[PDB]
């Protein structure tokens with residue numbers, strides 16, 4: 025019940041006590057582990073509020089103070105009266121920073137406390153949402169000196185007035201199915217790219233077309249907006265040794281900004297809460313470029329390198345994969361855009377674990393997602409035992425809106 | 432209850448029902464996942480249900496469930512248990528058991544081969560010298576001049592736990608490791624503790640970088656004894672690179688036969704504490720783990736130096752680059768010497784097919800993602816995008832404590 029985790033490369037052992045505060049469930053049982061599965065009222069709400077406020081007031085060292093008791097009572101009264109409640113600004117920021125802190129799949133959490141929270145709870149329309157989002161993008165981008173941020177739109181009420189951003193990221197490339205059978209641009213976004221045109225977008229049918237935003241305010245029909253290009257920082261991808269690289273026509277965007285998640289704080293559900301940080305290089309180079317169900321460029325790069333692609337055991341895929349990722353990091357760094365390599369990021373995460381075990385009694389972590397998708401065992405997280413559990417406040421998945429929207 | 436897993440690369444969905452027949456625990460609860468935790472004297476009381484469950488599986492597989500043969504066997508085993516507190520498996524049962532333990536090994540990517548396991552019954556063995564002889568025959572059979580064949584040798588089962596057979600070596604063939612007074616290590620760092628034991632027991636260590644350890648063998652709960660595997664029986668491969676002529680000068684080699692010998696085979700409640708087993712290597716086991724783990728041979732620096740890579744900023748990905756060349760060398764050398772080896776692309780592709788096949792014909796295939804995914808180039812292999820259910824079936828291979836920690840010395 026007071027659990028141990030061993031690093032197998034360094035024999036370092038940490039004792040986890042924090043897992044006992046785990047509220048939600050994991051998908052696993054004593055009979056089956058689901059560690060690798062992608063996605064396993066008034067009386068409900070007051071305990072949720074209390075749990076949160078208790079941890080809030082404990083974090084500011086006023087646990088069991090008049091302030092605490094008062095606030096606890098204040099919210100208690102509000103729930104009984106309004107069937108919900110509102111967070112003080114301070115709680116909103118605390119909650120968001122902590123939802124990031126508790127995200128077990130996130131390798132970048134060492135930065136958790138330096139998050140800029142933009143309070144967008146006074147927003148009422150989709151045009152307003154657009155303004156807030158452009159402001160977020162411009163701030164976070166910061167001319168390539170990236171800064172973490174989240175913009176928080178109003179909380180769910182009766183579930184009929186939901187704020188939602190339909191894009192999965194604020195900035196993604198469009199995906200169109202060709203008559204010739206293959207796919208142009210990004211296959212992952214084919215369906216969304218449809219629903220854009222299907223809602224009125226005029227698609228340039230190019231390879232790297234920044235998709236428009238599809239913003240839904242107060243449960244209304246969602247609207248289309250084009251992010252000002254001057255706000256969308258992009259990086260043309262070149263290799264520091266292969267001059268033919270450029271002619272592949274590859275570029276990627278600087279700002280990774282997840283927008284389809286649900287932020288949960290003290291029982292409250294913020295269904296529109298786009299958040300951004302900066303890329304780890306492998307996210308673009310390994311996953312975005314080389315996944316079979318994505319830009320799938322391996323064969324072409326390898327051809328250009330004149331590699332023996334006859335037998336899998338020449339490791340030509342591996343050889344190219346490395347070069348591609350050297351180029352991604354190279355380009356980004358050249359153009360002075362923030363990026364981190366998987367070696368540096370994983371090392372920072374280990375340090376972050378140390379700190380969390382030391383000052384918080386633990387750090388929930390999902391090994392399947394923390395270990396980078398290349399060179400797994402030459403990064404230190406590979407050899408690091410991790411305990412995965414769910415703490416709140418949290419970010420959670422939610423259904424795509426098109427499947428849900430009462431049109 | 433039905434359960435579905437999805438492959439996110441192909442959207443292929445499968446349904447697991449096999450997990451219902453799962454007996455043992457996982458280590459996970461509803462509130463915690465221990466999926467990346469590495470390691471998460473039995474009475475007649477608990478034994479017969481285990482025997483019956485085994486015998487039931489066995490007789491289903493040969494299409495004789497409920498037959499008189501089935502019923503007599505259950506009767507026979509029942510009687511022998513209460514009579515003698517244990518029981519002996521027929522040869523057919525031992526074989527079925529050992530294959531299935533492999534078949535149920537959720538961390539094993541090479542399971543497509545499971546039905547083709549040569550089982551050597553060593554249950555008549557009484558001494559350590561007898562153990563040495565059996566193991567030598569195993570090594571020679573499995574090696575087959577480089578054309579490797581899967582085998583397991585099975586020594587007598589545990590009785591009162593005071594008379595255990597154990598192979599003290601973690602693998603039948605492994606390189607010695609020696610801690611130097613300056614704190615550096617010569618040879619394989621993973622094997623320092625074991626090497627010291629051997630030296631203590633009287634082994635004369637040549638003290639080089641690739642010394643094949645002696646076998647340290649315990650029969651019938653007696654003190655272990657030392658034996659030197661005849662060198663002519665140990666196949667080794669000099670490592671060279673197909674393009675880098677300086678690679679050979681690094682002075683690297685590895686052995687051809689991966690043969691694990693410190694695990695415990697559990698069949699129908701019986702416990703086989705000495706059951707060395709072998710197959711052939713996936714290239715990354717040597718190339719990524721054995722050579723490039725920081726706590727192993729750790730040759731990344733020197734390979735990268737010789738490649739004259741930019742070793743100043745890690746964002747040069749020099750580590751990744753050297754890692755690939757090193758793994759290219761391992762595969763090239765093995766194929767060149769005609770010693771069976773499989774690359775991680777081929778191995779993972781085959782496991783996916785095996786896995787799908789097992790869902791259709793068995794109703795599931797327990798698999799441990801953390802261990803199935805290769806330690807380099809994870810996401811460009813198909814297992815990365817494959818959801819998997821982990822659960823424990825019997826028969827199974829289990830960990831057991833190192834015997835130097837439990838042994839009662841006779842002197």
Ligand code: HEM
Nearest residue numbers: 124127129130131132135172174299300301302303304419
């Ligand atoms: C600052 C640099 C950051 C880096 C390098 C980073 C990196 C990553 C990576 C590689 C993943 C794996 C998911 C995937 O590969 O698709 C991930 C997941 C995640 N990140 Fe971070 N991230 C950063 C910032 C943030 C911020 C600012 C937030 C929220 C405020 C955040 C929240 C999350 C969450 C909730 C997940 C997992 C979502 C899920 O359950 O799938 N991250 N991150």
Ligand code: HEM
Nearest residue numbers: 533536538539540541544581583708709710711712713828
């Ligand atoms: C024939 C070719 C085989 C290949 C390529 C193969 C490959 C592997 C690999 C790479 C691992 C991961 C372990 C590590 O990385 O340290 C593994 C685990 C395992 N293998 Fe196989 N294997 C083969 C045959 C066998 C055989 C013949 C047996 C037993 C009869 C077996 C039983 C196991 C077991 C029980 C584990 C997991 C051990 C644990 O719980 O840590 N494998 N296998």
Ligand SMILES: CNCCCc1cccc(CCc2cc(C)cc(N)n2)c1
Nearest residue numbers: 132280281282299300301302303304307
């Ligand atoms: C595929 N699983 C769901 C994807 C949703 C998601 C949530 C959080 C992060 C990511 C990866 C994109 C990303 C986002 C952020 C803020 C930083 C980063 N480095 N990378 C995806």
Ligand SMILES: CNCCCc1cccc(CCc2cc(C)cc(N)n2)c1
Nearest residue numbers: 601689690691693708709710711712713
């Ligand atoms: C401390 N326990 C050491 C043994 C752990 C282990 C069990 C099973 C397989 C392995 C990997 C070595 C191996 C064994 C076999 C039979 C085949 C193979 N490719 N690779 C390690």
Ligand SMILES: C[C@H](O)[C@H](O)[C@H]1CNc2nc(N)[nH]c(=O)c2N1
Nearest residue numbers: 406407408409467468469801802
């Ligand atoms: C802590 C972590 O589970 C440990 O390092 C595991 C990770 N996955 C692995 N996978 C394989 N095949 N072999 C290993 O030794 C390990 N080690």
Ligand SMILES: C[C@H](O)[C@H](O)[C@H]1CNc2nc(N)[nH]c(=O)c2N1
Nearest residue numbers: 060061062392393815816817818
């Ligand atoms: C099925 C498996 O869970 C799936 O492929 C996961 C594996 N680990 C991952 N890890 C990261 N960082 N990102 C991912 O998208 C995935 N996908």
Ligand SMILES: [Zn+2]
Nearest residue numbers: 052057459464
């Ligand atoms: Zn689990």
